[PDB]
Design an enzyme around this catalytic site. Structure first.
Site, PDB file in Angstrom:
ATOM      1  N   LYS A   7      -8.861  14.023   3.294  1.00 11.66           N
ATOM      2  CA  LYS A   7      -7.942  12.878   3.380  1.00 11.66           C
ATOM      3  C   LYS A   7      -7.153  13.038   4.680  1.00 11.66           C
ATOM      4  CE  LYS A   7      -6.219  14.069  -0.531  1.00 11.66           C
ATOM      5  NZ  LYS A   7      -6.034  12.852  -1.384  1.00 11.66           N
ATOM      6  N   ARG A   8      -6.416  12.008   5.085  1.00 14.35           N
ATOM      7  CA  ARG A   8      -5.631  12.114   6.322  1.00 14.35           C
ATOM      8  C   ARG A   8      -4.578  13.226   6.218  1.00 14.35           C
ATOM      9  NH1 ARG A   8      -6.143   8.063  10.524  1.00 14.35           N
ATOM     10  NH2 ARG A   8      -4.460   9.353  11.386  1.00 14.35           N
TER      11      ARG A   8
ATOM     12  N   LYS B 148       0.898  14.340   1.480  1.00 16.85           N
ATOM     13  CA  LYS B 148      -0.372  14.716   0.862  1.00 16.85           C
ATOM     14  C   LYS B 148      -0.428  16.224   0.555  1.00 16.85           C
ATOM     15  CE  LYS B 148      -2.862  10.818   2.947  1.00 16.85           C
ATOM     16  NZ  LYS B 148      -3.604  10.191   1.810  1.00 16.85           N
TER      17      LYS B 148
ATOM     18  N   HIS C 176       0.781  -1.234   0.000  1.00 19.21           N
ATOM     19  CA  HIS C 176       0.000   0.000   0.000  1.00 19.21           C
ATOM     20  C   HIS C 176       0.816   1.289   0.000  1.00 19.21           C
ATOM     21  CE1 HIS C 176      -4.146  -1.442   0.222  1.00 19.21           C
ATOM     22  NE2 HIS C 176      -3.660  -2.465   0.903  1.00 19.21           N
TER      23      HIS C 176
ATOM     24  N   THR D 215      -7.880   6.754  -3.254  1.00 16.23           N
ATOM     25  CA  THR D 215      -9.228   6.320  -3.620  1.00 16.23           C
ATOM     26  C   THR D 215     -10.214   7.480  -3.516  1.00 16.23           C
ATOM     27  OG1 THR D 215      -9.467   5.405  -1.389  1.00 16.23           O
ATOM     28  CG2 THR D 215      -9.051   3.843  -3.200  1.00 16.23           C
TER      29      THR D 215
ATOM     30  N   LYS E 167     -13.669   8.815  -5.901  1.00 14.00           N
ATOM     31  CA  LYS E 167     -14.957   9.231  -5.359  1.00 14.00           C
ATOM     32  C   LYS E 167     -15.430  10.565  -5.957  1.00 14.00           C
ATOM     33  CE  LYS E 167     -13.429   6.961  -1.129  1.00 14.00           C
ATOM     34  NZ  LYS E 167     -13.159   7.084   0.340  1.00 14.00           N
TER      35      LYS E 167
END
Ligand SMILES: C[C@H]1[C@H](C)CC[C@]2(C(=O)O)CC[C@]3(C)C(=CC[C@@H]4[C@@]5(C)C[C@@H](O)[C@H](O)[C@@](C)(CO)[C@@H]5CC[C@]43C)[C@H]12
Ligand SMILES: C[C@H]1[C@H](C)CC[C@]2(C(=O)O)CC[C@]3(C)C(=CC[C@@H]4[C@@]5(C)C[C@@H](O)[C@H](O)[C@@](C)(CO)[C@@H]5CC[C@]43C)[C@H]12
EC number: 2.4.1.1
Lengths: 813, 813
Positions: A545-546, A551, A354, A653, A657
């Site tokens: 998102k986290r 990120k 992952h 992911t 969405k």
């Protein structure tokens, strides 16, 4: 009301109403005079759950008779969210229940809001597990989800003075109507002890016993009458535990702490003993359960057939101990010879990676495994020895390869590399997006790929169109169904048909109307629940998102400040109004991630109360981001921020969405963004920034943040504002860590993508000024989002890894 | 089969069968192919529970409309046992369910054996609470039982090598179908903190909060459609608890340990903090609940009416903190003046004393209350000051009275005397049998009785004829009903009518037949469950109760050894064969009680395997004595051993169970034995030993055990056998502590009653040789056992303490 929600036919509505009243009276022991909405939710939940059990029993009956190959999905996380609406949808009960509850004088939507999220995951990995279970049931696979029933899931996030506070997610307080406790199927799990050697081989003795008690939750397929099982293990003390007397009874808690709480780390390894116990706990209980099921079948003593009857999928390295555990059982308990047990193990197990981030990789200190699992360490050493003999024979003389490939890492503290263990003991290793799978073959697992090229695969991630379209966006699902019918819900490739509507004036109007309704509903949600005021006519710019450095929420922060500074420079100039929404949880010990959250709120404090700005720029931090909040904000979004540094986000992911729900995507060529842009066409995507190649070039030369600071005046101004206390007047040096990190130790090169990002953001604003062209681009995205259905992903796993054929065929009702 | 079990009418049997199948399928998610007896038990339990809820809801509806005075029974123990059969009996469902389960091919009796005991008590006090709840519902009182939902009840007793082992009573493992969780009615409980003084009086601040969550269990009246509530509190951590992160979540266990485990001490005080927390926990949650109910009524601000609407009964001193807690709420929160709050408190509260033994009295160290409950200590000092001013004014100059009567005991460690607190703050104080109530007035509470004679009452204990006749002895209930009808079940005085059958040859035959069936069934139970062999033709000599020195299991042991030694002396002489059964749990830390258990088994080891003895003498230790074991052994008994030293057993209730079920009683003039002998006539009782007066005489002179040893050769021989290792060949000195205690420090004068006891036991054997005369004496006991119904006891509480009228009237079904 709408077509896709099923029939509300007189006979069903009447039967639902009476079972609702039966449960209110007999199950809840209430009546209409005292009942609260919570009581009404539970009565509905019990009524709906009743519809599952018949199907649940006959599905499990069917698998017993047919005896198909069984899929075992092992994960420490199942991020399920709410179950009520999902169950109604998959059962075709949604309109019937809406009607039945209407006639009882109740609003079903109000009742749905009462259900707690099953938040037994952190983010991407956990939610992928949930989408997978839905798709596996929908595709008729004999599949089981195995995990841990955490008493406390991911913490609820409270913002206080701009700072994150964590509180316990007590999701079971009022009970969970979906699960069924199965105390009769309890199994022992062993810890500690020592290894004894005999004539009849090794024996693991003097162990501490913890009981594993299973809880079963039904997983319904979409309209096919298939109901699979998610089995979650709960930790229980044995009754002879410690047995002065009082203390012995109180110390039973120690054993039961194993399943107490989910570790709140997204993409980060923490070498804690409790975590290792959790990992072994789920692995040992599940494997016993798998074997017991194998022996008690219509087929079968003979473990040769084991891999024909069993597939075990490892969701990351968290259940990696399944490999030495299966060896332990086969060798020590079943008395198979090593080589036969090993062939069976490799053909049974498969591993999904992952992340490539080094700090996320599980590397357990040998001294922990020595104490906790002495037999498993021996098996690990033996696996390693035999594996390194294979490497030596294939690459003779290559001594550095040997140390690189070893499962045992040498150093001050010896560690086991769990990823290396997984590769050696699995017949298949896959990444979660094409670029991510290539990076594995080229960099971190290059050595293993050279040894066994046949082992390496790609399986690009997917999301379930049921939860992520039909459930959360009924309006959009309906206007699509009007044109192309309903079959797309379980065959998302059919959305391509929508390309022939890109010039259709009615459809353009409808797509844009659904988005506006979604935005109006969400703006109302913000006022009612959080007393915050937004302009529903602005562009909804959302990054959810986290909270992580890779990120790059900070890159977003820099743009937001640029927009503010440009407005303040030229106040009377027209700008496309934006609502910038950022949301996500920070791991409790992740200091930098906590600082970023504070920055975001601090920016909003300045921007949202500047009269010169007006309603042109709003910055909102979305508190307590979780699955049920995603179901609300995603349909309301215009712009999806997917701005990770190239090569860091394995797939993503969230990106999918947003594509499915009519937002346009601004992002880097990272993870699945690459495949999304490929599907839609790059002209229909806002791609910016370094590619993977550009990052590598910058690393070789060395990354110097000062260079960008010197050559970009707009960037300099922002850094000076941060340093001088513009965004923190009371505490001028509050953000010194962030500035310092940006200037001197930025692993993720925020500044390097700044210019291209800002310029690309201007192109987004330009397109938004022309509603018709924005919407036509939106339609081009929705129409090509088909590939990113987890039905596709799961069919690829089934055919290329597990060796089972998917089926869309109904079971009899 | 039998009349008293109700009608099995076609319509009911058919409806029961279909709801059974509905629960098996929908509730348990099983089918007939996989179902075990446990699954069948649960399906039945759910079917029966369904019949309660309508009645439960309308009973609580009725009390809301009528608004009667409410009775609150506060106890730390509710020794409920099994609920299934009791619910069927009280609902008239027993034959219908027997039929319905028969037709499904199931044996209901086998299903009943699966239910766990709710063992939330130690013995007499806890079981009295259970009998009381049954009677209160049967008599139509608006009554609530309030206690603690212990996760672990009284330990399961295992005998290993003759020694007691304790294991955790995990009674909730498979779930409890009877309770209904009520998380919505959760209440905060405060601990620690400090007291702040203001203009507006004292404030208790900086407290730790523990949540109290209620669980409701229905309590059905006998055939009257009344279903009262037993509410048990469970401890929960608040969600901001401690809130590194993981540890904070794990430490939630600390708060929840409050309700984890019942303290296993019968008639013994242990000054542990956890115990004090339990006591305050139940008191604080219950009082808030009582007050909330008082305010939200059809009547009512005005606390003048409080005592007209509320009675609070304190089962021993364990909930004594209700007194300062009620004061705290009234004074600190409601702002009533001290004198008014105090008048309300005294008129609301009443206290029941259960023992005169000094080691059982609760005397809490001041430093514990100072830390844990700083405000309550202040209120206690103030109560004491004002109370001592009343004593000074009534008995001027009597300075020793002042120190004797003080709630604060002086010494190395200052203690609060909780019994003194209860007397001062209650309008009524009662003992539990006439002799016990007299002893309170004459000795331990003499000073208080001189101050307030009007406060002191007797309420002789009782047992419920439903559980303790109809349920456990259907055969006897049936033969009684044949002659005199069914009305006696809720009016046990009617059993007097049986006196006119004492010369009836058919009845004599029937009474003796039922006893033989009971004995045969129990002998079969011993073989099947414990692989032990007994002669069902022998006299069943049974002593079952908690293992304590004052209960004198050792006196019984001495007789048993005398019988053995007499047999071995004259082997070929005829003796009435006996099975001597002794059963009971020892508190885990009670060393002497553990030694006695070992002696009993050690005696059986010698006696049971002596070929010369044959089947003439058997000594069996009944393992794991508890309510459901009592229901089996009591109907099977011929001789009831009630042999406590005069003045030590306050009442006893086991004694009454045996009288009702056709055993004859050998005992001292202690507790309720006195009233039993009075009811039956002393000629129909085997009374032996010192009266209370004789004990006092012996104490004045001094008790010298050596005297009896010197003058009784048969006693000497036994002591020599014990000392020399006759009963412990491998460890000759194993019993040195027992011999030492007997010879030098016997508080309970075992030797002083030895001769009279042995001689009286000969008279028992003589009567048993004449079956007709034994049975006629039995009939004389059963016929006069009416007074010992808890319906009588409860009617006396209602009329003389609570000021409410009992009702036998039905609620509409
Ligand atoms: C053999 C046990 C084992 C003791 C524990 C694991 C097991 C499993 O395979 O998961 C537990 C569940 C049952 C008992 C099991 C097997 C079959 C049943 C079955 C499908 C049997 C079927 O006849 C029933 O009608 C039905 C269909 C209904 O009772 C059952 C359903 C339950 C299972 C699947 C497994
Ligand atoms: C006021 C609450 C309080 C918030 C908590 C304590 C309370 C109590 O008195 O025990 C809880 C229970 C209810 C809600 C309470 C009162 C009345 C109801 C009631 C009898 C009301 C009645 O109309 C319903 O039909 C019925 C008969 C049925 O819903 C209810 C039953 C429940 C009670 C007694 C209490």
């Amino acid at each position: 009301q709408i077509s896709v929600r099923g029939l509300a036919g007189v006979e069903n509505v009447t039967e639902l109403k009476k079972n609702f009243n039966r449960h209110l009276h007999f199950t809840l022991v209430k009546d209409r005079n005292v009942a609260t909405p919570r009581d009404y939710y539970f009565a509905l939940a019990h009524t709906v759950r009743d519809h599952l059990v018949g199907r649940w029993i006959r599905t499990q009956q069917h698998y017993y008779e047919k005896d198909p190959k069984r899929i075992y999905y092992l994960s420490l996380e199942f991020y399920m969210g709410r179950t009520l609406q999902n169950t109604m949808v998959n059962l075709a009960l949604e309109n019937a229940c809406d009607e039945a509850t209407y006639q009882l004088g109740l609003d079903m939507e109000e009742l749905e809001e009462i259900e707690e999220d099953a938040g037994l995951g952190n983010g991407g990995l956990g939610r992928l597990a949930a989408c997978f279970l839905d798709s596996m049931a929908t595709l008729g696979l004999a599949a089981y989800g195995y995990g841990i029933r955490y008493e406390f899931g991911i913490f609820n996030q409270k913002i206080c003075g701009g700072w994150q506070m964590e509180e316990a997610d007590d999701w079971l307080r009022y009970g969970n109507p979906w699960e069924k406790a199965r105390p009769e199927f309890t199994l022992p799990v062993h810890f500690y002890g020592r290894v004894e050697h005999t004539s009849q081989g090794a024996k693991w003795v003097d162990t501490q016993v913890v009981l594993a008690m299973p809880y079963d939750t039904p997983v319904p397929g979409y309209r096919n009458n298939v109901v699979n099982t998610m089995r979650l293990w709960s930790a229980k003390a044995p009754n002879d535990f410690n047995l002065g007397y009082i203390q012995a009874v109180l110390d039973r808690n120690l054993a039961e702490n194993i399943s107490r709480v989910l570790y709140p780390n997204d993409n980060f390894f923490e070498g804690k003993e409790l975590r290792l116990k959790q990992e072994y706990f789920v692995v040992a209980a599940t494997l016993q359960d798998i074997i017991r099921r194998f022996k008690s079948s219509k087929f079968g003593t003979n473990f040769d057939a084991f891999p024909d009857k069993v597939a075990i999928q490892l969701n990351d390295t968290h259940p990696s101990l399944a490999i030495p555990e299966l060896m332990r059982v086969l060798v020590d308990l079943e008395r198979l010879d090593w080589d036969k047990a090993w062939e069976v193990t490799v053909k049974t197990c498969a591993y999904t990676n992952h992340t490539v981030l080094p700090e996320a990789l599980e590397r357990w200190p040998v001294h922990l495994l020595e104490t906790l699992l002495p037999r498993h360490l021996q098996i690990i050493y033996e696996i390693n020895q035999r594996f390194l003999n294979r490497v030596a024979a294939a690459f003779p003389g290559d001594v550095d390869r040997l140390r690189r490939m070893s499962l045992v890492e040498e150093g001050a503290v010896k560690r086991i590399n769990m990823a290396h263990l997984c590769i050696a003991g699995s017949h298949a290793v896959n990444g979660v997006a094409r670029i991510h799978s290539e990076i594995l073959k080229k960099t971190i697992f290059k050595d293993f790929y050279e040894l066994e090229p046949h082992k390496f695969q790609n399986k690009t991630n997917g999301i379930t169109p049921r939860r992520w379209l039909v459930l959360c966006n009924p309006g959009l699902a309906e206007i699509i169904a009007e044109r192309i019918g309903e079959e797309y819900i379980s065959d998302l490739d059919q959305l391509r048909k929508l390309l022939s509507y890109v010039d259709d004036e009615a459809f353009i109007r409808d797509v844009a109307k659904v988005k506006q309704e979604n935005k109006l509903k969400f703006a109302a949600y913000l006022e009612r629940e959080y007393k915050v005021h937004i302009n529903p006519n602005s562009l909804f710019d959302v990054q959810v998102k986290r909270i992580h450095e890779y990120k790059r929420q900070l890159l977003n922060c820099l743009h937001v400040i640029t927009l503010y500074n440009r407005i303040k420079k030229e106040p009377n100039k027209f700008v496309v109004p934006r609502t910038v929404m950022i949301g996500g949880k920070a791991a409790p010990g992740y200091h930098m991630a906590k600082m970023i959250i504070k920055l975001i709120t601090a920016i909003g404090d300045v921007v949202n109360h500047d009269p010169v700005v007006g309603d042109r720029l709003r910055v909102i931090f979305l508190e307590n981001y979780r699955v049920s909040l995603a179901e609300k904000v995603i349909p309301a979004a215009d712009l999806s921020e997917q701005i990770s540094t190239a090569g860091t986000e394995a797939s993503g992911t969230g990106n999918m969405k947003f594509m499915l729900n009519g937002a346009l995507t601004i992002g880097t060529m990272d993870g699945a963004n690459v495949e999304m842009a490929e599907e839609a066409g790059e002209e229909n995507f806002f791609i910016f920034g370094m590619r993977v190649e550009d990052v590598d070039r910058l690393d070789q030369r060395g990354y110097n943040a000062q260079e960008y600071y010197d050559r970009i005046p707009e960037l300099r101004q922002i850094i000076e504002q941060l340093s001088s206390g513009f965004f923190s007047p009371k505490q001028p040096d509050l953000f010194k860590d962030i500035v310092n990190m940006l200037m001197h130790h930025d692993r993720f090169k925020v500044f390097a993508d700044y210019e291209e990002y800002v310029k690309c953001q201007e192109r987004v604003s330009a397109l938004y000024k022309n509603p018709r062209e924005w919407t036509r681009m939106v339609i081009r995205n929705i129409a090509t989002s088909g590939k990113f259905s987890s039905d596709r992903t799961i069919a690829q796993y089934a055919r290329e890894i597990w060796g089972v054929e998917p089926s869309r065929q109904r079971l009899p009702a």
